[PDB]
Amino acid sequence: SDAPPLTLEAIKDRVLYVLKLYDKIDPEKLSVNSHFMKDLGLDSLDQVEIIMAMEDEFGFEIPDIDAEKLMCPQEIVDYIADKKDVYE
Amino acid sequence: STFVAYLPDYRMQEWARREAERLVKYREANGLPLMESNCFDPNKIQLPEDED
Amino acid sequence: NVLQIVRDHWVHILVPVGFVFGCYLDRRSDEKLTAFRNKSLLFKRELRPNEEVTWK
């Protein structure tokens, strides 16, 4: 058929995969609730690059107003799940 | 719709076709022209005497 | 019991009766225009041994 029914666990796994392929973020020190500015010490440009990396991974763009707000991987996963009607 | 489809031929299309077939047959055999420019016999028409 | 049925659905004969009355009046009107019956140069005809008029 078509693509499988994307789930929250898969979304979180892919988000963490992309974030751990980032050279400016240490893998183990990164957690699902880690903040980009406070905990990881990244500036705004790094956040923009992360948002673009998420867009490439899932194949869909995120509006700038919405993109600016997400600060931790939990917010990214929640936004993706709400966008694609993922409930399980 | 059925009634209109089966209305009798009061427009005389087939009658006219058969009459034309008879006329064409008769005129072709005799060597006469198929059709005539004048539909009225000139012998029954009286033109004005003077044209000057 | 047909009393109520008739008093409820007697309005259903007005239009057919009007239709037959109109047919009758059309026949009557045709009856007054026979001044040239069997008299046209195209349709003039000798009568049959039994019939009286060529059309009604």
Binding site: S44, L45, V48, E49, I51, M52, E55, G59, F60, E61, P63, D64, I65, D66, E68, K69, Y79, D82, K83, K84, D85 | - | -
Partner: protein, 178 residues
Amino acid sequence: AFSAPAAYLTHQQKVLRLYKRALRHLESWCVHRDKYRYFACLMRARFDEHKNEKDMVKATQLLRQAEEEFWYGQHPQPYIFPESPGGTSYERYECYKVPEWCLDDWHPSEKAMYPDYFAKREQWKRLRRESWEREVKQLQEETPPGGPRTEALPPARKEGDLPPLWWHIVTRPRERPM
């Protein structure tokens, strides 16, 4: 699309938006990944060169110059995601979206199939009917006297309240309805 907008954008917001636009158009120009990475690193270095300018006037002048350069050098046919507002599948599934109120007009024979679904629907409708007045009154309390100044809505705060004006956000048709 989900957040309420603000009265205006800030200078850093404009710089971030220009940075994203320039990166996307450069990726459109640089089809291959390694070349894109090279020129994207160059672009990031160029962006963060003037990061520490304390004169806001010269910062806005540089932003103006950068926007003019972007407009001159943009890709005439940039890559668009298929479901983005210019993509090939932008509004493809909008014709399959049917509002939920249409179910109220189904014939009882149609509703004879799916009994449990309609029982759940009745429960949801009762929930909305019970929560409406509390939502309205909470909005009345939290609204400043001179009317609202933004399009942001307050959440639920009380025992079993619901966030006001939730019915048409929660009961969206779907993204792939049929």
